[PDB]
RNA sequence: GUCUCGAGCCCUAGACAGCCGGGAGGUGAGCUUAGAAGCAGCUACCCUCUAAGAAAAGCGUAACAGCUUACCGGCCGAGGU
């Protein structure tokens, strides 16, 4: 029901296309509270029990795109 | 006696207080 | 070395020199087991295969004798069954069991019937497009089955285009 | 082919092989692209669930799918490499 991870990052970033080489070329940016909003939405999609580990799965797509956390 | 097997027996003994051979080893403890 | 094989309750086996007869409810199989310094005997309820020599060649045959006897045990109880399917593209192949031999007619359009003789107490039953080769002796059954597949051998033309023939579908 | 001798490593906390079972999710990674979802190319190759399970080793598909590899568990039981 809930849309994929790649699309949900592009909504609260302002950028559409990623990069040719990740982490080496920084594109978008997210905050600490902005990752806590994406962790609330995906409950049946993720197999994690706690809300702490649910955030780590979203970050597993972020730094491998060009999204820096500040 | 491999180090991972020793650390696994210690992980199973922890979940009894709170492979089938590694469970049996932990039950004897 | 010495390997002891326990005889099943359905089975009873006697020994005469180098020959071993194995009887059961599905039939009887007599095999000759002859090799240098390997003594095969029946110790009441067990079959013993032993030798004073432990060299690579002696060990090779001890293991072969073991599998031959275990196979005879399975043969006289449950039996041996090979399942085969007859495939044809253009020409309607007539597979039939005429007497103690299985005859194949009109293969690839041939006027002359191809035939092979059935080995021993092996029974070949046909049910339209399916054939089941069965019996107690794995040597006899395995060969009769193979012989049927080998009977439609084509060396002259391409096997990839001319795929007609009876092939082994099930192996026990 | 077979015989003999040495060295290293693995093994009843169950090795080697075989067979059964599992091979899960975020997500079909992103870029490229009409599309590419382990597997055309480029780059990265990250974390959850867990006893395991690669950003996929080899086939396979127009792309999927499908078949298995790694890896984990079971059966087995003695040497194995
Ligand atoms: Mg020619």
Short mmCIF file of N, CA and C in Angstrom, two decimals, chain A residues 39-40 43 48-56:
data_model
loop_
_atom_site.label_atom_id
_atom_site.label_comp_id
_atom_site.label_asym_id
_atom_site.label_seq_id
_atom_site.Cartn_x
_atom_site.Cartn_y
_atom_site.Cartn_z
N UNK A 39 10.05 6.52 9.31
CA UNK A 39 10.10 5.33 10.16
C UNK A 39 8.73 4.97 10.75
N UNK A 40 7.84 5.97 10.81
CA UNK A 40 6.48 5.82 11.34
C UNK A 40 5.54 5.18 10.32
N UNK A 43 5.38 0.11 8.56
CA UNK A 43 5.25 -0.90 9.62
C UNK A 43 5.09 -2.33 9.07
N UNK A 48 11.50 -5.15 11.33
CA UNK A 48 12.02 -4.66 12.62
C UNK A 48 10.96 -4.47 13.70
N UNK A 49 11.36 -4.74 14.95
CA UNK A 49 10.49 -4.65 16.12
C UNK A 49 10.44 -3.25 16.72
N UNK A 50 11.62 -2.66 16.93
CA UNK A 50 11.75 -1.32 17.50
C UNK A 50 11.76 -0.23 16.43
N UNK A 51 11.56 1.01 16.87
CA UNK A 51 11.54 2.18 15.99
C UNK A 51 12.97 2.67 15.71
N UNK A 52 13.91 2.20 16.53
CA UNK A 52 15.34 2.53 16.44
C UNK A 52 15.99 1.83 15.24
N UNK A 53 15.67 0.55 15.08
CA UNK A 53 16.20 -0.28 13.99
C UNK A 53 15.49 -0.03 12.65
N UNK A 54 14.28 0.54 12.73
CA UNK A 54 13.46 0.86 11.55
C UNK A 54 14.05 2.04 10.78
N UNK A 55 14.79 2.88 11.50
CA UNK A 55 15.45 4.06 10.94
C UNK A 55 16.73 3.68 10.19
N UNK A 56 17.41 2.63 10.66
CA UNK A 56 18.66 2.13 10.08
C UNK A 56 18.50 1.55 8.67
#
